[PDB]
Symmetry: D3
Subunit: 117 residues, 6 copies
């Protein structure tokens, strides 16, 4: 009934393979992505934390490193790297290392994002 969240940003290149022929999103293009990891459980009586942040950064780092300053399409499972797919992919990578993960949000621009539960 308490939730935490943490934002990270990464710089990346991608393109959408399944859009019609002219579409601007089929060009190779890039963005400053924002990812929000959201976490839900009990507040620890001694530490007063649901989770240490240094834990959360450590458990995300392997996945973060694959995304940042990379080309998304070269990453297995991101063959079609829209926000929807990216956020599912991210959940799939993070959830088995962060059991208390309750949601992933991805934002490609400042005016548009996607949330996966």
């Amino acid at each position: 009934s308490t939730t935490l969240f943490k934002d990270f940003t990464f710089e990346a290149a991608h393109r959408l393979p399944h859009v019609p022929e002219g579409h601007k999103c089929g060009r190779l293009h890039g963005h400053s992505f924002m990812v929000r990891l959201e976490i839900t459980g009990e507040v620890d009586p001694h530490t007063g934390w649901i989770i240490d942040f240094a834990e959360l950064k450590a458990a995300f780092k392997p996945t973060y490193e694959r995304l940042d300053h990379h080309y998304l399409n070269d990453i297995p499972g991101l063959e079609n790297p829209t926000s929807e797919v990216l956020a599912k992919w991210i959940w799939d990578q993070v959830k088995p290392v962060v059991p208390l993960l309750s949601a992933v949000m991805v934002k490609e621009t400042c005016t548009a994002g996607c949330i996966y539960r």
Copy 2:
């Protein structure tokens, strides 16, 4: 399971008619409104999208074009143009042409708003 949202902003004038006599919100005034449209449903296996963003831009244009750089009180329904009523009004114009709309959020200033579901 998956949600998407898209943010727009318009510049309009409004004033509240039902506040007490000298209240600042009863004077002719303006804001940079932000509106957020939230969509929920199935991710298409092939496009990797819930909805094309261009369908949405197009289905909101007419309602948008009515709000932007206008005086709100002169639009039928926006007689009492608080944030609450305005989010409800946008939902009401928008839900018929975007069946997957799951929420409307209105912000009048950067420090306050309202969400209608």
Copy 3:
């Protein structure tokens, strides 16, 4: 269902008493905190408001005045003033004087927060 929310910022010092000895969060430090108060209920058909912002500002001021330009550890209950605890603590001061309160959000930095419902 309609939800309102208002955002406030205060400047404050704190430190965490229960982290291990090296840790940077055990040092005397501070932040620009953000508290989001969120309210749920019925829109008044006459005023077009779930609540008047003036009643909200007035009901939170006592709590705000305690938090702002202060050292958080010196407030009873905020002895371990993390986000999770800061937010439960704000809910307990505010729920009694704002019965439609539905959530409290606290952010310490721009990239990390906590929500209590």
Copy 4:
């Protein structure tokens, strides 16, 4: 050289009377304006300030009063309330009571502004 700046926002209705017939700016609209007041001068060796802020807030207050939650065009000197006009008008009102003011910046939208000196 040392410079201070302070940012204020106000909400306000306006319209531009000298744009052509169709033009959307010639329709009654509003924005959330941002004004930045910039001040240059000696730092006092004892207080470490160029100026007390409360002395800037109090010296701006009467100009800020006339602008916040008002229709700009009713204000003499603002009959044509473009950004360039509105920043030169604020300097004309503030400069006499803050003789260290060195610039005034007005923004109407988050992406556009104007600087007068």
Copy 5:
């Protein structure tokens, strides 16, 4: 004197060819770029403007459409697309069509940019 500025954002891929072997910036990556164009000139007595905003949108359009949703390295003059080269290149495409232009600010990420001229 008076100064105007207008901000644009474009989404794009690039990478640096002249950085050391392993350097992250030599991978294909991208950013959400910010470009600020700054204009300096006389305010016209009758319109109250330095320059019509959409006279400026229309004049940046061909330079903008080439940068947006594109791969910076394919464009002639941007074979080494650093901030500093980007900014001067934007200058060189725009200056000839916007005589009053007085500065180009390019930003690659929220916390880093460069100003030419």
Copy 6:
């Protein structure tokens, strides 16, 4: 010529000890500060940079680690930690190790700050 800027944030405590009896700024308090370092110089013909953004972090690291998650009053030179004094103090710590530094900006809150050259 060309200017680079890079922004950093740190989380600190302070209090001013030279303000009158009651003043809110004389109480132990904190902010999320922001510091912009600004650098001016030749763009290198081959690298297309003025300075390497990595040589800047390394040279600033020792100063940033003294300010971050600390109480500013304990640091010599910051006896009276106003924005103005702090900006000047950052200049004096950084200029010897970054000779192309041309300005330092400090922001205590999102709505106020100070530039030193």
